[model samples]
Target: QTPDREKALELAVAQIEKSYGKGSVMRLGDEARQPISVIPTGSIALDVALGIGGLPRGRVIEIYGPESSGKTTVALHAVANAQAAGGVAAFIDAEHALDPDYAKKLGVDTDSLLVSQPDTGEQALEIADMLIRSGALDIVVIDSVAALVPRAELEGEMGDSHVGLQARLMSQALRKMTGALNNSGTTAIFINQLRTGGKALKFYASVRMDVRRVETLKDGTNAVGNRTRVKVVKNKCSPPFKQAEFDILYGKGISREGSLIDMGVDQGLIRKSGAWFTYEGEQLGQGKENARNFLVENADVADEIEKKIKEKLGI
Candidate 1:
């Protein structure tokens, strides 16, 4: 029996070697055999900070935040980055929040981007399904998952039996879409909105980034903070239970420079100076503090190092 078991193991190992290449099976035990290459997301700072130096080629990343939090800006920047990297990008606009003018400002190659504007949530799903099935896209972004469900279903009085059913169905549909895109090696991004729920009932997103208004003081200067609180609620390749803080900026093209402050320190300062804020003569900092304690708690050794010394250090 012992000999037979050993023989079986040998056969299995040999077959794996034959299929994947000689010594490949053994290499699996070696951690150094990992693939290394950053998938550029077109934003230099974001890519650099992400460690991978770019978005992964075949994966889904969900961006969740509040209104006017520069969610669209990130999507557009990614599109521009993907196109600049010689890959086609697609924007699945569920809420019709995509502005072509903004895309132009971001220097996204419209020729390489396939923008799908669906009239309804159901239609959006159908369109997304078809686009994924087409197999021509490199990056596909679903703009706002909250909008995927019909307004009437999401709104209105509670205790309505139909609402629960609709919500479940919508969730299932999103899951299915996510699965399909992931399986096809096509990168996908889902945008989600924040909602008030029980403490345990957090928002739905692989990456839950909370954008809140904050204030900061630095270099004897007090300024309003435009930093976003990003929480990675779920992930596959990297750690799922991590979070990051980022500032969103808008610009004309893939360059992170020369862009209008879309949703961070620059915007906060401008808003404070303008008539948008409630108080006057408030001293704030220029840049916001990026908190990644959540990420540090859940990060791998390499990720932790990258976040601390490489990313945070601005090295």
Candidate 2:
């Protein structure tokens, strides 16, 4: 019943729809369109700006930057946040970058967290594939893709050919992981290392967040202190280019249960003043000022925060 020319036309239409947005005919039925909920990574401000509530249910968010730029910190926070939302999270540690104690300190539920520590990139990919197929996780984070590249090749012995090959392999793995996550509505976050120098070096990422150290004036009366700048080099969802500034604090815990117990008073104070002030005053005015300044300096942060709160609270 199918003619050759008609078959070719049908194939072309399918290809076009897949590459671009689906055509009008495909969207005719409203029943087929299901709204997607943004999955919050537990960070209040982060969840707000990243519209849709949080990160997309089935997508990869690649975080990359120089060493000690808080790439792992954000990833861990996301895992904990996902767990707080009653979802399971998995981490595929390709370079053994995750510290169990540090994760605990950050408030991640280890019981609901699955970790895969593999010796080589290939082994890591294998573990990732397995984890994706498990259908038991809500978020899966890969520590570092660049660590998979053999140091000898990057040192200039292997040349561009090998570099290209390695890049292809990484891309293939990413595609596979994305496909698997898409099927189960699980989110994936890939942490990568940035390479500097040479024409041969090319940057690649789906949603690249470049974090760097910046010196901001210390609050109230002090001199200056260091803070982190999260530059969004490539983002597919909201905008192509955007950035956010955040102060990296480790060994701190945000308890949902405790927050609930201290509800009325603490909630009222934070809501009315737009600040979270504890009796201990550990962060106090200084932290509040910094957050305000950060929001002012980066409009995207405010937008993201608002978006996250609305999504999480259904406001």
Candidate 3:
């Protein structure tokens, strides 16, 4: 079949492609490629609202906010989910804030997850690119862009504006690896911390989540955890700025327990007639807990509720 190779090699490739599936051989123009598999964000609010049905692999997403806003928490949540799905992930902690105990408590597979804490953005991108190119990891996270110092300014004059340098490095990294990531089904999420102003470096962020409205969750006088409003700012894969509040319990991670009921109330999947909860003429219960318990008891209806919510979300 070829000049140097034998016909046996060609037959072998055909057999491999038959099972592995091949890509576009000679694509020219106009034909849009099929989207990649969607890995859920582990939060129903974020998952249902995004049009991709979840976070699209092989792309760039950033979750940015002030301190105590749960940026690292959500990033680790994605890593845990990826590891649970038999995939590998990496966490490049630029801020020197990776806590093994907390990550383990959050369900992260610390054994398989590759962890690195670098001092500069340049090195972070280099190691991140290498991990992505290795084609072994399914997800990578650069936690907190605010802490990423540019190599040039690691010893340069203090008080100089390094934002531009960081943004440039980030842009170059995206240009270099986004296509590779897309083809390999790997997701690279950057957790960012906001500055005094509201803006953060967003040179090539395909999806942006802005966390705000933070409040401490306490069980009577004991601090239990926190909750925040994660607003989708720039979603090229979906709508613009669909806001949802997420709850994070202490020692545990983000919980999606109430999301089924949360969307149910918003989408009219559950009806409220004076204190009673009903769905399509069927009474669910009286209190909020009982209404949510109804959906939990009925798995089929929960699926139905999920389908309805996704339809309403236009995903």
Candidate 4:
């Protein structure tokens, strides 16, 4: 006797596929649901903190925080990493304050990056939509959503009636961008300032990170930089609520070697006995400062240690 249950299910699926489209109504054995790839944020500690090694390439990532919280630096670092991997990236400088020269100093290949400063919120969203649909770039960064001014608000005089216009535009932009990103291999990073009522972005963003300045870095009692805390508030690719810290130099961006050493200890790749530090069974000298200097001087050893960290994290 024929198994009518199985036959009936198969026949129903066949009918649906025939009516809808081939491969459109098939089982979920496999699909283009996962991210095509991930782009590193240029901080080993931050990357390790994000269980997927980096931000997923085909989802919406939100990095929101107060001023001087290293949000723009983090996004630029992602662009640099993407360019290093032979992938293209673009920046919609909604803030209109991006310095190409400074971006170069931060290790981003300014020559290859396509940057635009849109006049209005609609223009910014349209540019992002076109870029994502064209599939020519791997990632796009919209700098500071708080600055994306709508046309009405832009043309209106100061103190004119303006209410809920920015939010409405943002909601519409999110809807359009989400559909465009469904089957494409492009990631969108929206840098937003600390503000309330981003319910639309929060609900649609695949990952939400909150960065803040924790402590200032010092050089012989002189302020050289600051340590910033990056907390993954919500994540769809990995477990949520993971956090990491990194040192952001004034002009040098994130210190790569220093973050590696810090994360190495945090992740147990580096062992400490009393004041002596050891990495992979090799002596890193007798103090934290000495260990950092050792990694700084020996770049290849640092690379090897980074490889081990990636292996352990399965990134």
Candidate 5:
């Protein structure tokens, strides 16, 4: 009976391998075995709820929001992460919002980045495909599909004649690009605006997130930042409905107090004591400031926690 049970377990693994592929089966939590390389989304707070471990390479992720919701800000994180990992990045500036200074402030290395402006949605997809096909760019942002008007519809020739046209075009483009995207180890992010017409987008993305403005940061009379919440509407990388929230300040790219601590606590990497936090029975801090400072002051400790957080969150 024992040998029979062992044989059954081996058969289960064999079946999974046969169905997934020779390279798909590996011990869980092993980095070398993951199907794709995950690029960090730049915010520990955001990465906690993302559950992708990080923004996964070789997949299509869609981020949508209303105006001033920090859509571009979050997308830039992936670009920064990719470039930080020694890979080139590209931004397909369909929305005409490419401010070099702003991007640099957001941690995007513009000198190592390529930027392009496409007049139509088709052209934007074409550019993205070309870049992905070359395998030169590790991350690319199409900002955004909502700004993309078909070439024929640029002048409003039909004037609402083709409302769902781009949706189909987008679907077809993704269907064609899915293979290349998965193979090249590059992550493609599409920035979109929330619209009544956006339901069509769900079918195409491997991951879909909706960004909503929760509040605004004000410096006296001026708005200095945005507090946005993102919820996963769809995720192929993990169970859907996981959510995360973070802040995007005017000059500061991502600002959240004790975010990594918050992340660690949530993931069981850090635990609450009577009035403090501890990791693996070691006293990390006896106060909130201590926990925050600990994570800030100890780079190696921070990285170790980040890895554990990603392991639990990512598929």
Candidate 6:
């Protein structure tokens, strides 16, 4: 029986791939099956929390949060990062509320970004499915799931009862679209508003992250932006329950100095003596603010510390 094991493997590979598509099936221990690819989300700390440095390609992810909690900014930052790697990006504006200037400020190339505003849920799903199946793009963001209105709901009278219609549509759409996402190796991010009922979508998503505003960042009592915390509530690719807190500067992007300082302290690269902070045994400052300022001014030192932190983190 063992003498024909190689022939059995060859037959299985040829038949399975022809029906399921190329690279659809592979041996579990084969080197030909490469590791999951990821696109960074701009914040190194948040990327670390994601466990793969970014959103994994060929998988679906969900990011849900309250209004003004930096969800859209984070998604756009990921798109920017994907673009920087010479990959194309698309945005399904189901909410019809994309801010071009803000996206540009976050380093997104607005001109090259394929943006679409679908009028109905079915149309939006069709667009997403097509893009994923084509395998031509690297990433796609549906902004967002909450705003996708079903045709029945839109056409119904104001007083008509149409509860659960949208959910059913989503259940059906994701069922078929999930396969396309995996087969094409496209990273699909579905932005969602905070709500309770999304059992079907959540089941289909490989990663689910929740964002919340922790506090308002202030510079001399003037509002600059908000500090947000992102938690990986669910993950299939890596360890779950990981979280990261980072500052999102308005009109700028995620600040690196804050995360780096925290990581430096965690890794023993920066020592705290009394009220002062010492990096590599050299006194940095007497407070967090002073240390952040020093790192911001000295980019080279900051890079070195970050390099060490990343190496230690194994990401």
lDDT of 2 by residue, 33-134 (tens): 223665654344344334333566666677777776777777787788788878888888767656777788877898668887766565676677777778
C-alpha RMSD of each candidate structure in angstroms: 12.7, 10.0, 10.5, 6.5, 5.2, 6.5
Lowest lDDT 10-residue stretch of candidate 3: 23-32
| Tens-digit lDDT string for candidate 4 (1-315) | 369788998888889768854433434222223344789887887876676788886789999888888988898999988888898899998777787776888889999899888888889889999999997788899987887887877887554465777787888889989878766778899998985227689978888999999999888889888898999887766666779998888888888877887888888988889888788788887876677778879989989989988777667
- Arranged by TM-score, best first: 4, 6, 5, 3, 2, 1
* lDDT winner, 1 or 6: 6
Which has the better lDDT: candidate 2, or candidate 5?
Answer: 5
Ranking by lDDT: 6, 4, 5, 3, 2, 1
Off by over 4 Å in 5: 1-36, 155-163, 196-200, 216-224, 267-301, 304-315
For model 1, the superposed segments whose C-alpha errors exceed 4 Å read: 1-39, 42-51, 150-161, 196-229, 240-315
Task: Itemize residue pairs with steric clashes in candidate 2.
Answer: 47-308, 48-304, 48-305, 48-307, 48-308, 49-303, 49-304, 49-305
How many clashing residue pairs appear in each of the predictions shown? 8, 8, 0, 0, 2, 0
TM-score each candidate. 0.56, 0.63, 0.74, 0.83, 0.76, 0.82
- Which 10-residue window of candidate 4 scores lowest in summed lDDT? 26-35
Candidate 1 at 103: error in angstroms?
2.1
Off by over 4 Å in 6: 1-36, 157-162, 195-197, 273-278, 281-298
- Candidate 3 residues 115-215, lDDT tens each? 89886777888898888888898999987676666777786846457557766666677788777787777888888777611133364566788876488
Error of 1 at 174 (Å): 3.7
> For model 1, how big is the CA root-mean-square deviation?
12.7
lDDT of all predictions = 0.51, 0.58, 0.73, 0.82, 0.75, 0.82
